[PDB]
Amino acid sequence: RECISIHVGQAGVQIGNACWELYCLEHGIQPDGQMPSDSFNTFFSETGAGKHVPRAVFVDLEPTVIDEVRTGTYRQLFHPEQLITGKEDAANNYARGHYTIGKEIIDLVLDRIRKLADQCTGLQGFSVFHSFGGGTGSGFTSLLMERLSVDYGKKSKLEFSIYPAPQVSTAVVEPYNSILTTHTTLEHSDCAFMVDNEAIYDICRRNLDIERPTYTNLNRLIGQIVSSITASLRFDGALNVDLTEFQTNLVPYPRAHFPLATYAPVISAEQLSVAEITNACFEPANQMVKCDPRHGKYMACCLLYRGDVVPKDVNAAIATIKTKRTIQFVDWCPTGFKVGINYEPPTVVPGGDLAKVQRAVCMLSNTTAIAEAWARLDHKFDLMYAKRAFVHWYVGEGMEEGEFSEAREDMAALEKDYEEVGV
Amino acid sequence: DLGKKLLEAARAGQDDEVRILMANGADVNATDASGLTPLHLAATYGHLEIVEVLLKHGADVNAIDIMGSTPLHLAALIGHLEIVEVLLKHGADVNAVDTWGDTPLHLAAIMGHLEIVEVLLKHGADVNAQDKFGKTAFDISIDNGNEDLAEILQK
Amino acid sequence: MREIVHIQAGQCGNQIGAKFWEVISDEHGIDPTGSYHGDSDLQLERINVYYNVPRAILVDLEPGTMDSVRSGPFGQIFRPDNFVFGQSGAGNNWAKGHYTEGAELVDSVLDVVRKESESCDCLQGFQLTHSLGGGTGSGMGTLLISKIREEYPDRIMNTFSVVPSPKVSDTVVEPYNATLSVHQLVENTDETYCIDNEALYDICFRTLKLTTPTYGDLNHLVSATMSGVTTCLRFPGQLNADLRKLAVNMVPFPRLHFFMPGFAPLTSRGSQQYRALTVPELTQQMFDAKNMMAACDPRHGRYLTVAAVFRGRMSMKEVDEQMLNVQNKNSSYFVEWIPNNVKTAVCDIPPRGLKMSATFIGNSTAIQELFKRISEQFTAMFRRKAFLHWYTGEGMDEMEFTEAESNMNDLVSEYQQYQDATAD
């Protein structure tokens, strides 16, 4: 019944905090772990003393970020053995995350995962949170995913990748790191939700009304949308009740397993209808990955409503969009939109710039227009690899230069795989 | 893969698990390794309710496999009179030939399914159809001393 | 990636070195006795980087320099053991610093380096200040670097090397010494800030209108630059946080790691700055070649990578806008095949005596101009074979000069290649 979450690099770790902050508010769980109040034990385990502990591992090749976890609001929530830190970071280098530094700590990390999996009876699989451009996030994750495909091979693994964006980008080589992990993590991931930090930036500047967002701003918005996807697993809905169903509903091709997530509504803290929010799911401005689905074919599409929702309003709003817009599907797909509803209201953080809304929706749709995002990375990659720029850093940390090309071909092949489906 | 679960379901005969798999959009005309559709498997192992469900959701009644076996071939071989009549009602090819040159009438005659022989005949089965060796269903009744089948073949 | 071990070698090394410790001790709120009298946590957040008391080793063959440091303002704070000094001086002979006399002492220095590294939670790398036209700072410094490089290959090597210019010393052997030293730095250091005395004089003379600049005047510009480039390292911040990440986003090709630093606004020694600059004004001290600490014209080449550090309270929105502006309004000057090669970071704590400031670290191919000047002076000297008996007598071979000459010219050619490169 149980799902294990893993957080790799600052991105994973800090988005993790935002998600487990938000999970504990949605489940009425206290910062100390207590609860004055099952479906939610998919994510949490239980102590003999009435304390509810997350089924989570935090990993970073450097203390600073995870140190703030275990001296913060939720320091008591996690067991200290779950929070793992090295000393030398990967320094924005996939090679160090995967080869040089990652091998020094991979075994300790896999060991601490076994301790959480041993507590579980019918383990489903893994949720994995990590950046693309980060050295740890790219290199170590891809390594950990390889090794989880051995030590737990017969079960699911889901990604929550943070797609890079120059507005918050810390490194020049982030295209490299993105391509390198996506190549080596392609075969080992069953489904993967990309999060373009540019879209999250754009959304927070427009709909949250912030001049220069911070990471807290972006992570909170992101955690809201992650909660919307994992709500089906935490409250026992009708749709997407276990990790296999994500692949069944959204993945009709092992490789092409990258859904576009769209979330409405994002209301500043300074109500809409069911129809209004469902139209916003087909507005590009509210997507998590910047692309144009109008330029692409849908392989599948799920709608996860939560809150004050009448099942008939949904069917009206669906028929509205199925008639009054031209959402092109592939011919070999069930042309019907899958739906599920969870009547509990979207929780926000007390203090949050995001307002409590009466109802909300998160549309998960495996459109071929998301290939546009791969094209933007591949292009940036090509410019730098044309001059072998920054390549010596990678090659000097245990990586063969060939691996660059093998990865790029796998990304070129993936761009062809998206094309042939959509023609 | 939902097309492989539907193949397994139609074979093992889990009527509910066929309906469920079809409710998630499973491929009704999915082939296994040797080209066998779920209709092949349901008609082989005598699962009448699954046969009628697949036919009503757009299964190719005349789908062949790697050996040219139609569902009517396999139903008449195993001796499923109920399914033979359902297949014919959905426009099955009574005189389909397979890689060995046999028609459904050949297989029902060899296995002694006299009631199915009579049904096939009344739907215009070709008594003069020959197999590879050159033998008709009537030749099979003569060569195998089967006077009950010889009589039903000339009725 | 926490602690940094600092080294200063030779006269110049300990001069701009001590000046650097003066500047960042104030900024972090440390007095000469070594006690915190600040009033902010953003000051002691990453004090562990440069301090324990400085993590600084002082080196010179010239024993007099010992006292010039301790008799300075913050001279009391440095650990007595970390002073390592020879009996005689090198006398502008790179060979004496690298092979003979400087080599005799280098072991004693490595013993102290080891001692300071031994008690580090997690070392980042090293930081050496020195001049290149000297005998000790160049010859023994480069020998120290290699000796550390091989004893600590898992660490960064970061130098603040100052280039000789006839405008500051008429010694003609400096082209030899600096050429030999550049032949070392291109092979032995991950990143090197090129401090050009030619440019320091031209700034004190022409922009600051001082008819006779002293070392102190040139050293003021340097110490302020160093605190600027080390702002990311010393205060909390997302971007260019540690030495390795910096070099990762600054150095695309291992040999081309010579940064052209420059910062703004340019102030005199303790002058009054009534009018504080605006964000667009600071931003327009980047291409402004009168703010470069290296005597090169960024207009004459192309930027491979750029790091901008804005210090003070100001609009992060406006800085982003101005930087995004100045990049695309001069798009032909930034290399196209490295996307998002310019990176900007802000620190709220301004430098001493200024309300706002901005430092501009750039890997510009124009730096080839600097290496051109050194090589032409080297070749003019070397073709007449002047003063070679100094170096050869100390065990050097005439061949070495040819190799260093050729190797610097390869370094110039490489910069010229990537300048003329195209994305197409």
Ligand SMILES: Nc1nc2c(ncn2[C@@H]2O[C@H](COP(=O)(O)OP(=O)(O)OP(=O)(O)O)[C@@H](O)[C@H]2O)c(=O)[nH]1
């Ligand atoms: N949305 C979001 N993005 C983040 C967050 N933290 C980092 N990022 C992005 O992730 C990318 C890589 O940074 P990190 O994840 O911190 O790198 P890392 O995984 O720690 O790897 P190393 O630091 O190199 O060892 C950058 O482009 C950041 O923009 C976060 O909390 N939220």
Ligand SMILES: Nc1nc2c(ncn2[C@@H]2O[C@H](COP(=O)(O)OP(=O)(O)O)[C@@H](O)[C@H]2O)c(=O)[nH]1
């Ligand atoms: N900017 C600056 N340059 C110096 C200083 N002292 C010496 N130099 C330069 O360094 C070179 C002389 O080397 P020096 O460091 O004095 O010799 P060393 O003691 O053997 O290392 C010449 O190019 C001088 O112009 C100083 O205090 N500041």
Ligand SMILES: [Mg+2]
């Ligand atoms: Mg990190």
Ligand SMILES: [Mg+2]
């Ligand atoms: Mg001296």
